[PDB]
Paper text:
Intriguingly, the autophagy adapter p62/SQSTM1/Sequestosome-1 was recently reported to recognize N-degrons, the N-end rule substrates of the well-characterized UPS, and where ultimately these substrates are delivered to ALS8,9. p62 is a key selective autophagy adapter that plays a role in the degradation of various cellular constituents such as misfolded proteins and their aggregates, malfunctioning organelles, and invading pathogens.
However, a recent report has shown that the ZZ-domain of p62 also recognizes type-2 N-degrons, although with weaker affinity than with type-1 N-degrons. Therefore, we determined the structure of the ZZ-domain in complex with a variety of N-degrons comprising three type-1 N-degrons and five type-2 N-degrons. However, the side chain of the N-terminal residue of the N-degron is recognized differently. The side chain of Asn132 which undergoes a conformational change plays a critical role in interacting with the first residue of the N-degron. The bipolar nature of the side chain atoms (O and N) of Asn132 allow for the recognition of positively charged type-1 substrates as well as type-2 substrates, and especially N-terminal tyrosine and tryptophan residues since they possess polar atoms in the side chain.
Numbering used by the authors: -3 to 44
The structure:
């Protein structure tokens, strides 16, 4: 089967917990840690 997963564009691990997906960049995601460290902070993100 094809497993769908979201990998953080900062630590390159999978996103567990909150997912911070950029609203501007296509297909860019950060985990809660990388988000806290201020990566990609110049773009609005979707925190679901
Ligand atoms: Zn991360
Ligand atoms: Zn972006």
């Amino acid at each position: 089967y094809e497993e769908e997963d979201v990998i953080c564009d900062g630590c390159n691990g999978p996103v567990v917990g909150t997912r911070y997906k950029c609203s501007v960049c296509p297909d860019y995601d950060l985990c809660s840690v990388c988000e806290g460290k201020g990566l990609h902070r110049g773009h609005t993100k979707l925190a679901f």
